Design a protein around this nucleic acid. Structure first.
Ligand SMILES: Nc1ncnc2c1ncn2[C@@H]1O[C@H](COP(=O)(O)OP(=O)(O)OP(=O)(O)O)[C@@H](O)[C@H]1O
Ligand SMILES: [Mg+2]
Ligand SMILES: [Zn+2]
Lengths: 145, 607
DNA sequence: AAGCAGATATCAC
DNA sequence: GTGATATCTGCTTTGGGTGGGTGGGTGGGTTGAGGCAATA
């Protein structure tokens, strides 16, 4: 009963395996001057100081991050009756786009169950509400691009 | 002995327990009466009852089972012989309803105490004989003697009594008296396992009537005595290791998972006008809108008539796009059938289809007189394809390996699931070229069904509502569905038991005319049918007759068989270019239009 | 170190 | 004085590579690299 986090280089893995993943993220690095300049500035600072450049909000240490993660995991939020129609409306919208794209996307009935799974995870961070479904939807469509 | 056990007091207390205890006529008095009626000399006693009546007797039973249980046997025997003036005397088997310990928490303080543990059986040994009484014969005068075993040690005689010769008594092994013993390996239950640790295992020893009472795969609560035994350093020396090994002496097993009224209910169902559709609906309530596939699977479950001159078995292949409900259907059929096997065509698979010193027959042989569900049909290698063709054509599996030459009966119905070679079904491609399997193998299936994924929005919305409703289904509905499934299983069992349909004259004429018409369709313009299909119809017709619980095949059965066959062909025999009537794709693997185009290409290149 | 095979002196009747 | 029967003495054991690969792997020892036939 474990979660699977896989990393692969595009060539050809079987489709029967790729459709099982809730999120399939294609990380593509297209060269662009300003972004490449910003990335280089970040990396040089890390080599220069052995830590990330300062930001407005300070990152939390691992010791402290593992406490919140465990604390959140105790909750068991549930999805109400009311959201049933709204989640359904999102599913058909995703399906329509997949058929229109004509790409090798894996939007199927399995996708509907994935919306619920992510939505409850988002709530466990925060009873599920419409804002968790919106974040779950946004995260997934951004994945299929 | 360091025990506060007075035998007489314990026996009296237990006799009092049998006399007076009442389950909230004494319960165990009724049990003794039932023992007399049945004749099985075993009385099971719930330790919770003994605790409730008497807390001292319970405490002594748990602490000193070896000493106390025989006194219980004496008490029960005395009482029973009073109330009813049997191969053996009755034996008490105290047990705990629920486990009192976890396999991981067994401790030295529990040695020689009565405990209950839960687990799953993985291995059982063959029977081990234990000597109880040794038999000696003088090698000079043939005088015979018998010696009782004493704590695993035997007092060999030194001088013959009759002739006084010394060292003349030889042990005759096969004139002695032996009792049965069995070694069982119990695996820790998945629920009680801590996260990420490998399961623990325990050794159990069963004796006499408790041997062969469990089989590998069983989930059982075992009540027995915890034992510690020394380990010899090597077989030759009498030195022992300071760390003891442990096992459990089994005392009680508890396996933790027709009637005339039942037959009357089944017949009442069989009288209903729409029994076919009722059973089809009950077959797989979770799957949505696949009515014809469900009807075909029901007919496969019932099967045709075993003529004993003719395969009576119905083979069904479900090919389709990924993300449909094919695996769920296969799982539901596997659960339903009594002698079924669920397996995969991939070679790496844990359970294999092929037979492979112990002779290991594959799933196809194991599913003899049953259904074999094969999930990744398209992923079979060439050897597995040959094996499957042999099974489907001849219903036997031949092996010639490691000096063993034999033929194994495999009369099994194949329910197969197949995916396309591409990421999606290609409408331009026919069935043969969509799934890379030989046409010779495809021609052995009675029915091929296509589970395509629609582009319709309304279908998506309806399926979404179906799945959400299932996601919120209530416990009473689940229980009702389970009851309906049990009714279906009983109906199928009864039909297999007692119904053997036979072709009536009207059915024969209907079948002949049906075949002639199917041929005529092609003959009008190619060939639109071949004789093998006629056989399929017969099988299907018989299956339908069995669903009604009828011993005669009627014209209605033939009409239903024709409709189902014609629907399956319309699903899977369609040429994407022109039409459907062409069945040459199944017989030859190449579309007639494709054949003409290839002929044109070859002739042009020959120009 | 531990145990069986062989040799042999020794009590008992 | 003979029949046990109790005491004493010498052998070899173990698994092991100084005990061999000219004993044999049907007497019994994980891990890796290297030829085959069938394989794709
Ligand atoms: N017709 C349907 N009825 C019910 N559930 C369906 C249907 N079609 C798809 N589903 C849903 O899709 C999932 C079924 O996936 P399943 O493992 O059965 O697919 P499959 O057909 O074996 O395909 P594959 O192995 O290619 O993924 C479940 O969420 C099931 O609810
Ligand atoms: Mg599947
Ligand atoms: Zn004798």
């Amino acid at each position: 009963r474990c979660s699977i986090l896989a990393a692969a280089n595009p060539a050809q893995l079987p489709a029967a395996l790729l459709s099982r993943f809730d999120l399939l993220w294609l990380i593509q690095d297209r060269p662009d001057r300003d972004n490449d300049l910003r990335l280089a500035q970040h990396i040089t600072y890390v080599h220069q100081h052995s830590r990330q450049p300062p930001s407005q909000f300070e990152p939390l240490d691992m010791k402290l991050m593992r406490r919140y993660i465990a604390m959140c995991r105790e909750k068991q939020p549930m999805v109400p009756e009311s959201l049933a129609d709204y989640i359904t409306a999102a599913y058909v919208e995703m399906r329509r786009e997949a058929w229109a794209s004509k790409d090798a996307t894996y939007t199927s009935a399995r996708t509907l169950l994935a919306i619920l799974r992510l939505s409850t995870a988002l709530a466990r961070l925060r009873v599920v509400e419409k804002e968790d479904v919106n974040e779950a939807i946004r995260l997934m469509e951004m994945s299929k691009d | 002995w360091g025990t506060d056990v007075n035998v007489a007091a314990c026996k009296e207390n237990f006799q009092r327990f049998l006399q007076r205890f009442i389950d909230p006529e004494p319960l165990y008095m009724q049990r003794l009466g039932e023992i007399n009626v049945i004749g099985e000399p075993f009385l099971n006693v719930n330790c919770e009852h003994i605790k409730s009546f008497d807390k001292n007797l319970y405490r002594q039973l748990i602490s000193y089972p070896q000493e106390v249980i025989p006194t219980f046997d004496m008490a029960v025997n005395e009482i029973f012989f009073d109330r009813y003036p049997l191969e053996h005397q009755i034996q008490v088997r105290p047990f705990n309803a629920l486990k009192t310990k976890n396999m991981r928490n067994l401790n030295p303080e529990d040695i020689d105490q009565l405990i209950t543990i839960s687990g799953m059986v993985i291995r059982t040994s063959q029977l081990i004989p234990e000597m109880q009484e040794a038999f000696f014969q003088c090698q000079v005068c043939a005088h015979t003697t018998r010696v009782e075993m004493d704590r695993g040690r035997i007092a060999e005689p030194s001088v013959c009594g009759r002739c006084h010769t010394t060292h003349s008594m030889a042990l005759i092994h096969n004139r002695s008296l032996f009792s049965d013993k069995q070694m069982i390996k119990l695996q820790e239950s998945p629920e009680d396992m801590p996260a990420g640790q490998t399961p623990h295992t325990v050794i159990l020893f069963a004796h006499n009537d408790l041997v062969d009472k469990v089989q590998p795969g069983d989930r059982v609560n075992v009540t027995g005595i915890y034992r510690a035994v020394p380990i010899r350093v090597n077989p030759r020396v009498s030195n022992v290791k300071s760390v003891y090994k442990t096992h459990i002496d089994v005392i009680h097993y508890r396996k933790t998972d027709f009637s005339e009224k039942r037959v009357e209910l089944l017949k009442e169902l069989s009288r209903k006008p729409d029994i076919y559709e009722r059973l089809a609906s009950a077959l797989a309530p979770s799957i949505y809108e696949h009515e014809d596939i469900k009807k075909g699977i029901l007919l496969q479950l019932f099967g045709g008539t075993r003529k004993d001159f003719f395969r009576a078995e119905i083979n069904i292949l479900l090919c389709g796009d990924p993300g449909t409900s094919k695996s769920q259907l296969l799982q539901y059929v596997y659960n339903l059938v009594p002698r079924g096997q669920y397996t995969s065509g991939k070679g790496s698979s844990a359970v294999g289809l092929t037979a492979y010193l112990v002779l290991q027959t594959g799933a196809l042989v194991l599913s003899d007189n049953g259904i074999c569900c094969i999930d990744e049909f398209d992923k079979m290698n060439e050897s597995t394809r040959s094996v499957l063709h042999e099974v489907m054509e001849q219903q036997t599996l031949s092996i010639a390996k490691a000096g063993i030459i034999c033929q194994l009966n495999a009369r099994t119905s194949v329910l197969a699931a197949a995916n396309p070679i591409e990421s999606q079904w290609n409408p331009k491609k026919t069935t043969i070229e969509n799934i890379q399997l030989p046409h010779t193998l495809l021609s052995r299936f009675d029915l091929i069904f296509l589970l395509l994924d629609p582009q319709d929005e309304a279908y998506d919305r309806r399926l979404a509502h179906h799945l959400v409703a299932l996601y919120y289904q209530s416990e009473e509905q689940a229980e009702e569905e389970l009851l309906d499934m049990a009714v279906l299983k009983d109906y199928i069992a009864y039909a297999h038991s007692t119904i053997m349909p036979r072709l009536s004259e009207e059915a024969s004429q209907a079948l002949i005319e049906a075949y002639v018409d199917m041929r005529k369709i092609g003959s009008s313009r190619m060939v639109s049918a071949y004789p093998r299909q006629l056989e399929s119809l017969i099988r299907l017709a018989e299956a339908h007759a069995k669903v009604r619980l009828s011993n005669k095949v009627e014209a209605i059965d033939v009409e239903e068989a024709k409709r189902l066959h014609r629907e399956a062909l319309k699903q899977s025999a369609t040429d994407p270019r022109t039409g459907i009537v062409d069945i040459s794709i199944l017989t030859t693997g190449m579309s007639a239009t494709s054949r003409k185009r290839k002929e044109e290409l070859a002739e042009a290149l020959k120009k």
